[model samples]
Target: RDYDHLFKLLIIGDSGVGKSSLLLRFADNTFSGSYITTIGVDFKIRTVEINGEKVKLQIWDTAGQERFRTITSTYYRGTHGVIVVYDVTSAESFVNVKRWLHEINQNCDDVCRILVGNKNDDPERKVVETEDAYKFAGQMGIQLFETSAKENVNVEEMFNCITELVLRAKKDNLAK
Candidate 1:
C-alpha cells in the first residue's frame, strides 16, 4: 500500500465486452474466456513502476448490465481516470461507448478518460473498424487503444498510458 501515488481507475462497458478479462490480464497476468459477470463492482491493486517511482493503481471493474447501473454509478465518484471499453467484435458494444462516456461525465468531474476497443486479435470477427474507432476517439479528444487480453496485446501499454496521464494531472494540480 505504500507508494508515491495512488490512482483510482474505472473500467466501464456493456455486458460481455471483456471488461473482466482485461482487468485479469493487467492485474494478474491471466485470462479466462468464461469469467462470471461482475456483480456490482470489483477492484484490484497493482503497483507499477512509472518514471522510476512506484505508483499504486486501484483499478475498478464495474458490472455492465443495465440492472446494475444504479450500483455501478456510485463507483465513479472520485475516479482519477476512466477506461471506456468496447468489444471489437460487437458493433453494438462499440455504439454504446457514447452512453458510457455520458455516464462518466454525469458522475465524475474532469476525469481523464481513454477509449479502449478490446478483443482485437480476431480480425475475422472484428466489426468495429480501427479507423472508424480512431476517428471517433479523436472526435471525443481521448486516446484510443485496441487491445486483446486473450493474446496479451497492448494491455501493459494501455495501463501505463493511463497511469502517466493521471500522474501528470496530479502533479499539475499540486503545482496550482
Candidate 2:
C-alpha cells in the first residue's frame, strides 16, 4: 500500500554541535566540513521501510543559537522523536544537554528522544567522555549514540532506531 506512518523528528542542540551535518548524513547520506548554521528551521523528508510498512520521516534541523529560539520553538509543536546532540569536542555543549532537554520536555512530554555525542571519530579531540555521557543519558532515561557523521559511524542506525521506537509506540497507542 502507501506510507503507513509519518514521524516528525527534531534535531536540537547548541551551535557547532553538528546537528545539521547529522541530519544531512541520514537524510541524504552526505557530509560537509564547512561551517554553516541553519538560520531558523529547515527540514528534509525521507521514506524508509520499517518491518513491512513505509515510514515517511520528516527530519527538522534547527538553529542552535539563542537568537533564533523564538523561530525554532515553533518547530517543536508536533515532534515524534528528538535527537539532542552535543559536540564531543566541547564540554559546554554536553553540559547544556539539560537545557535543550528542558526545552524538548516543555513542548512534548511523550516524544521519543536520544542523546548523541557527535564527532566521535575524533577521540583525541573529544572533551565529552563517553562514560560520563552514558551516565548522563542513563539518568535522563534516553538512548545514547556516539556518532561520527563524517565517517558515517552509527548515523543510520541511530536514525532508524529512533524511527522504529516511534513506530512501535504509535502502533501500541492505536491498539489501546
Candidate 3:
C-alpha cells in the first residue's frame, strides 16, 4: 500500500513495560501472551487508509535499558511521533516516562508524542494511578492512554487519535 504519508512513531519506556507487546498487537493484531526482552530495536509496519489514501505507520520499538539509550536516540531522527509507555504495575517505569519524554524533546524536533500506561487488563496488577497520568499528560500537553495490548482496549483508538492530531497539524501548515 502507498501511504499518503509515512509516519514513524518510536516507543520508549523502562525495560519490560510491554513496549514490544504494543508493537506486536498493533502490527500483527495479536499479542504474544508472553513477555520477552526485545533485542536491539524492532520495527513493525501497518497501513491504514484515510480518505482513500493509504497512511502507513512505521513503528520503532526500542530497548528501554540505559545502555541502549544512545542508539534509541538515533532512531528518533525524522520520527513523526513518540509514544512514551509505562507499566501499570511499575512506579519506576512510570517515573521513567518523564526521562523518555526528555529524550524525545532533547533529540527529536517532533513533540507530537503520546503518554501511555500499559498493562491495564487486570486492575489487581495496576500500580500507577489514572489521576497522576492525566495530571502529568495535561501539564505536558500530551495525551494519556491506559490500554491493554492483551484485551485490545483503546489500542486502535489511541493510534487513530494520534494520527488525527498529526493530520490536523499538517492541515494547519497547508493553510499557512
Candidate 4:
C-alpha cells in the first residue's frame, strides 16, 4: 500500500463554499458547520483502491479568500487535478468559477479538473442553475458534480472521478 503512486489535487473556491468541509467529509467522514480560515494552505490525505490499484491522494485545500493567491499561485506545479468549487446559493461564488478556471489556465497544464457545485442538499440554497454548471463544464471539457459535503452527497463519486481522471491522463488512455 505504501508503494503506490501519490497524486496531488488542489481545491480552489471562494469562501463559505465548504471546501474544508468537503475535505473533512471525504478525508475523515466527519463534518463541522464551522469555518476555519486556512493559513498559507491546508491539506488532507486519504488512500483508496482504484481499479485494483492502491492510490494515495494528497488534496490541497486553499484558503477560500483572495488574499493568498499571489502566494498560492506558486504551488500549482505537478497538480494532478483541480477541484473548483462554488456554492449553489451564492451567485458570486458561481461567478468565481470562471476566475478559478482562468487561474488554472495560467498555471497547471494537462491537468484533470472538475467544477463542483457545493451545498446542494437544499434546493432552496441554490442561486445558480444546473444548466450553468453543465454549460461551463462542457465548454471547458471538465466534469461537473453537485455535492453536499455536509451530507456526504456525491463526495465519493467526485473523488472517484478525479482519481479516475488523473489515472486515465497518466495512462493516456480511456479504455480502462
Q: What overall lDDT goes with each candidate model? A: 0.79, 0.77, 0.74, 0.77
Candidate ranking under TM-score, highest first, comes to 1, 2, 4, 3
lDDT string, candidate 4, 53-145, tens digits: 888888886554544433245666778888888898989887777766766666664678888999998887588889988998897778899
- Tens digits of per-residue lDDT, candidate 2, 94-115, equal 7677666766566556888888
- Alpha-carbon error at 75 in model 3, in Å? 4.6
lDDT score of model 4? 0.77
- Cα deviation at 77, candidate 1, in Å, is 1.4
* TM, every model: 0.85, 0.84, 0.82, 0.84
Q: Candidate 4 has what TM-score?
A: 0.84
When summed lDDT is taken over every stretch of 10 residues in candidate 1, the lowest stretch is 28-37
Which numbered prediction scores highest in TM-score against the true structure?
1
Taking the tens digit of each residue's C-alpha lDDT, what string does model 3 give over 1-176? 35687777777777778777787766843443323344566777778888786777877765546444333366666777777788888888877777667666667645478888988888787888899889888877788999888788998887787776666666777797
Clashes of 2: 0
Better of 1 and 4 by TM-score: 1
